[PDB]
Design a binder for these strands. Structure first.
Ligand code: MG
Ligand code: MG
Ligand code: MG
Ligand code: MG
Ligand code: MG
Ligand code: MG
Ligand code: MG
Ligand code: MG
Ligand code: MG
Ligand code: MG
Ligand code: MG
Ligand code: MG
Ligand code: MG
Length: 51
RNA sequence: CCGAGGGUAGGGCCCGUGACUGGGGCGAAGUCGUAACAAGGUAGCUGUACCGGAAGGUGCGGCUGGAU
């Protein structure tokens, strides 16, 4: 497998720490309920990589 | 003399436009309370007046399109 050289495009803020905010939308307290469901999911993902 | 029209001045109407402002219509979700529909938890509605974040409240009279 000839690994295609992916070392051509550079990136400034690619390794920097990131702010993440989740906001509820359409559907009243149901979307608010899901914004926690998205946040735990990103919490499981952050701790799974020692973040 | 009249006279197209030009000029000066002052009015009337209509249209476009204007910092800003007043409310109105619409919204798969927001905040605050819950005024009305049951006696809707203070029966409701009403003209008027005063008042209150807001639905609204209270006064004076009126109607029943008011339960028991
Ligand atoms: Mg003459
Ligand atoms: Mg003339
Ligand atoms: Mg003339
Ligand atoms: Mg406006
Ligand atoms: Mg009332
Ligand atoms: Mg009520
Ligand atoms: Mg009532
Ligand atoms: Mg009154
Ligand atoms: Mg006031
Ligand atoms: Mg106040
Ligand atoms: Mg009062
Ligand atoms: Mg009365
Ligand atoms: Mg009468």
């Amino acid at each position: 497998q000839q690994l295609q050289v992916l070392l051509l495009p550079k990136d400034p803020d690619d390794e920097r720490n990131a702010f993440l905010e989740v906001r509820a939308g359409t559907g009243g307290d149901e979307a608010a309920l899901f914004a926690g469901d998205l946040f735990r999911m990103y919490s499981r993902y952050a701790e799974a990589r020692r973040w």
